[PDB]
Design a binder for this molecule. Structure first.
Ligand SMILES: Cc1cc2nc3c(=O)[nH]c(=O)nc-3n(C[C@H](O)[C@H](O)[C@H](O)COP(=O)(O)OP(=O)(O)OC[C@H]3O[C@@H](n4cnc5c(N)ncnc54)[C@H](O)[C@@H]3O)c2cc1C
Ligand SMILES: Cc1cc2nc3c(=O)[nH]c(=O)nc-3n(C[C@H](O)[C@H](O)[C@H](O)COP(=O)(O)OP(=O)(O)OC[C@H]3O[C@@H](n4cnc5c(N)ncnc54)[C@H](O)[C@@H]3O)c2cc1C
Ligand SMILES: NC(=O)C1=CN([C@@H]2O[C@H](COP(=O)(O)OP(=O)(O)OC[C@H]3O[C@@H](n4cnc5c(N)ncnc54)[C@H](OP(=O)(O)O)[C@@H]3O)[C@@H](O)[C@H]2O)C=CC1
Ligand SMILES: NC(=O)C1=CN([C@@H]2O[C@H](COP(=O)(O)OP(=O)(O)OC[C@H]3O[C@@H](n4cnc5c(N)ncnc54)[C@H](OP(=O)(O)O)[C@@H]3O)[C@@H](O)[C@H]2O)C=CC1
Lengths: 461, 461
């Protein structure tokens, strides 16, 4: 049995960030990875999604070209061109990630790890055993898909993994779900020319976001040509002569339910959540606790129920974002190898951007969460809605909406929510201010930058 | 003589903001304006410049269209199209500004104001007299141009005012100066297809900015096809058969000076600073102090040397930016009509964006200013330079550079400087954090947003 100071199972965002910081602190560390270094972020997530988002953004600016004084463009998009370049960039990052590990003197162990039944926690990979006093599980997640028993033909649909294998633009797309991936993917496909429907169980997308965002985002999808099918769910999927036929039930409250078939569908995309990757770890051999979905249960320091075993990232099922996995991983390394007993990630005030069109930025509490926490007499909100001056000269319009949620007599800024051109790059600095405990006076006494969209946040009344 | 509570001379950014807030507090207020409401910002400054900047940005994205999978566009720009739409938008804002005053019950007095020799401060407009216990001078500035005695033919050149009257794209442009307007205008003209030279007295533009910015911006202009003529100055300008001929002297240190003529110039643009608009006010009749350039001297509360007379904005010659004029104007109104004796604008940590390509954002101290203030053993800087992932798939590249200047053991963040895609909308929230006295720990303990350019500011090492 080979002993290390730190053994990390999974070479994605959280595992790599933790292993790298531990190694800097002198730990002899090893990372086990069964597939590609960089994990979801690099291979089938953040990075290739952002490339496609930039592509979809080009398409929108193509629409405004004539408005801005140029000749209009015909613009038949070639999916194969950008796909090849996107894959090449992913390959470059895979190589960079490997180099980063080698330079940090971290051993890479290739294969699938599972725990053994040995007294002290030990893993096996390809018949060889490894142990350490500290073992991090950072195995991430995978897309959730319906069971064929519940939805016949569900396996004819793809997930976000399959989206990145597509080699041509689907003519007709149906996306099912109402969260991050559904919104981003519908925006990409629609902007690039697919006839796109988004099928959602209720009346709005992103229902866990502030109501102003959920409402505005649903409107913006419609305005961009996405057909939003409300109160609708898939009943069955059949392979026909010319693509898939999707049977759906629409059940609007106060009406009779109605069944419709959607013919000639080229791509059906399930975007209904993620499930943790823990089934094949043999967690039961050590009695590591999981919830009913398979997430590893941790305390505020990322400890599992077993001494010397930790978990970070998507596998724990909380705030499923690349930078959260990285920050939790790094804080854990400082606790273990720098002996900072109080080193942990604060899960409050995590900012997030949804790469819709226009993009959404949010940090902190929604108006409803604030009312629940502080009481309705203690919450004040300020908001504005305007058309960005980019569109002063265009026939196409998008809106910018911004809301600030303040609490108590001082009007501490407890939440900021916005959607609009530029909001993807606008949010980070406001999130620092929110984290520091800014009040509305702190915003108001900062001098504006003009003419920008961002200055509206410091001049709310 | 008609008496008011508050009389504001000039209906630009500072005067309008002050008059509006005073009126909200109950003051009976009047604004005197000789030309168009909205002043420089609306008519010949911020707003029409931003429209042209958005146009120049479209041109850049046209260049990357084929890289992103679309067919390339020929793209002969039509200047007349965007000019007409830009003027129409300006007209809309003029009407909105007028309505805003009427709704606030502020009287508009049309004409040119001058002080009279009356005991108590009194103005005259078109032969009628007005007085108030509080009179704000907010008359702004105008472009500086060389004297014909110093540069023969200088009057053949135009200024930024003239730029907004152009009805066609000049084929060949020479811009003289090395500050904000020179950089922005050269970027606009060059992106839209003019053969553009920028003539500067030293080796870099924006020399009062942090050295990392001055260096990077000069490089980016060159990379974008602007010819930067260093150590060069105009000696004479002559009208020829086919445009202007510009005689210049280039005097590189350590070399012999050399004279060159630039033939066939269509547009020569003087962008060499601004001068205050005070000559025709009859300031001498009350002994209001000015400096040698004509700026009205004020104290930290915007008081002139004469009781009951104040000045804000570009006329005072300090931090010549629209939001500074607005903030100083509003703070003054609260001091006078809400009796907040301590109400004043803090001129430290004012943020600014230069709309170059890519845009620049800066707030706080440059590295040199920090070293001077705190001492060299007390200043630490962190910086990064990277190619934004927008360009991962393009043949054209721009850079993103970011620098954080920290002071003392706590590493208080005393300056942030950056240039790069998106930096125009990124800066405002970091400026709030800087204003609140953030340390580098405050940045580092904010969770990043991925994938963005803005997250690099919270992950510097
Ligand atoms: C389509 C999509 C787009 C997204 N876009 C964004 C975004 O824009 N911004 C953002 O912040 N987040 C985004 N996310 C979420 C983000 O990608 C994840 O939160 C983050 O990647 C999780 O990092 P992790 O370290 O927990 O897991 P992963 O990165 O998934 O790493 C887990 C690694 O463990 C390996 N592994 C699993 N089991 C074993 C085994 N037993 N033995 C050895 N190796 C194993 C896997 O191969 C994988 O490489 C997106 C997610 C998706 C799917
Ligand atoms: C090309 C250019 C681009 C710029 N871009 C930006 C930018 O992007 N962002 C930014 O923050 N700043 C920018 N600025 C600077 C900004 O426009 C000025 O700082 C701001 O407009 C000054 O406001 P003010 O109230 O001091 O003066 P002004 O807006 O100039 O108002 C002065 C008003 O007084 C009137 N007036 C003068 N004398 C009299 C008289 N005696 N009687 C009656 N009325 C009189 C004038 O007609 C004018 O309307 C730009 C400036 C220029 C020239
Ligand atoms: N930009 C970014 O940072 C991105 C981050 N991510 C991360 O990955 C996570 C997972 O993404 P995603 O897959 O979109 O999951 P989400 O959990 O964000 O959303 C899925 C939504 O789909 C709806 N849904 C759930 N079950 C079904 C079903 N059986 N049939 C139809 N609809 C269903 C639910 O909404 P409803 O109740 O309203 O029906 C649910 O909230 C995200 O939450 C995020 O943390 C992913 C993509 C981009
Ligand atoms: N985005 C924004 O907020 C904008 C704001 N503004 C505001 O308006 C102000 C004035 O703009 P601008 O006119 O560019 O003035 P600036 O003062 O910003 O810059 C002019 C520069 O030109 C050079 N210069 C000065 N005299 C001469 C001369 N005789 N011959 C050749 N070069 C000369 C000097 O630099 P050097 O010593 O290196 O030669 C000088 O610093 C700005 O400072 C800014 O406050 C203006 C435009 C955009």
């Amino acid at each position: 049995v080979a002993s290390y100071d730190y053994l990390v199972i999974g070479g994605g965002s959280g595992g790599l960030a933790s292993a790298r910081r531990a190694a800097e602190l002198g730990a002899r560390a090893a990372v086990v990875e069964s597939h590609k270094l960089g994990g979801t972020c690099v291979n089938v997530g953040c990075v290739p999604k952002k490339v496609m988002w930039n592509t979809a953004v080009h398409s929108e600016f193509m629409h405004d070209h004539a408005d801005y004084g140029f000749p209009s463009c015909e613009g038949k998009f070639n999916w194969r061109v950008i796909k090849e370049k996107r894959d090449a960039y992913v390959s470059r990052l895979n190589a960079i990630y490997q180099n980063n590990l080698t330079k940090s003197h971290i051993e890479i162990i290739r294969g699938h790890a599972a725990f053994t039944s040995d007294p002290k926690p030990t893993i096996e990979v390809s018949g060889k055993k490894y142990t350490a006093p500290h073992i991090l599980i950072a195995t991430g997640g995978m897309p959730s898909t319906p069971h064929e028993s519940q939805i016949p033909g569900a396996s004819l649909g793809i997930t976000s993994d399959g989206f990145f294998q597509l080699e041509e633009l689907p003519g007709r797309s149906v996306i099912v779900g109402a969260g991050y991936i559904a919104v981003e993917m519908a925006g990409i496909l629609s902007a690039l020319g697919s006839k796109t429907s988004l099928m959602i169980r209720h009346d709005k997308v992103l229902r866990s976001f502030d109501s102003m965002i959920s409402t505005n985002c649903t409107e913006e999808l419609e305005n961009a040509g996405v057909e939003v099918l409300k109160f609708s769910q898939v009943k069955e999927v059949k392979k026909t002569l010319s693509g898939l036929e999707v049977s759906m039930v629409t059940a609007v409250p106060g009406r009779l339910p109605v069944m419709t078939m959607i013919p000639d569908v080229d791509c059906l995309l399930w975007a209904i959540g993620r499930v943790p990757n823990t089934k094949d770890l043999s967690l039961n051999k050590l009695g590591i606790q999981t919830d009913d979905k398979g997430h590893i249960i941790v305390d505020e320091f990322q400890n599992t129920n077993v001494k010397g075993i930790y978990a970070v990232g998507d596998v724990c099922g909380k705030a499923l974002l690349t930078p959260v996995a990285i920050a939790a991983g790094r804080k854990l390394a400082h606790r273990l190898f720098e002996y900072k007993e109080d080193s942990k990630l604060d899960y409050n005030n995590i900012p997030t951007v949804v790469f819709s069109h226009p993009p959404i930025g949010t940090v902190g509490l929604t108006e409803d969460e604030a009312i629940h926490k502080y009481g309705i007499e203690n919450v004040k909100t300020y908001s504005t809605s305007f058309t960005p001056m980019y569109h002063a000269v265009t026939k196409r319009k998008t809106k910018c909406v911004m809301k600030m949620v303040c609490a108590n007599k001082e009007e501490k800024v407890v939440g900021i929510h916005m959607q609009g051109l530029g909001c993807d790059e606008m949010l980070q600095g406001f999130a620092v201010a929110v984290k520091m405990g800014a009040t509305k006076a702190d915003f108001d006494n900062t001098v504006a930058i003009h003419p920008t969209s961002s200055e509206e946040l410091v001049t709310l009344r």
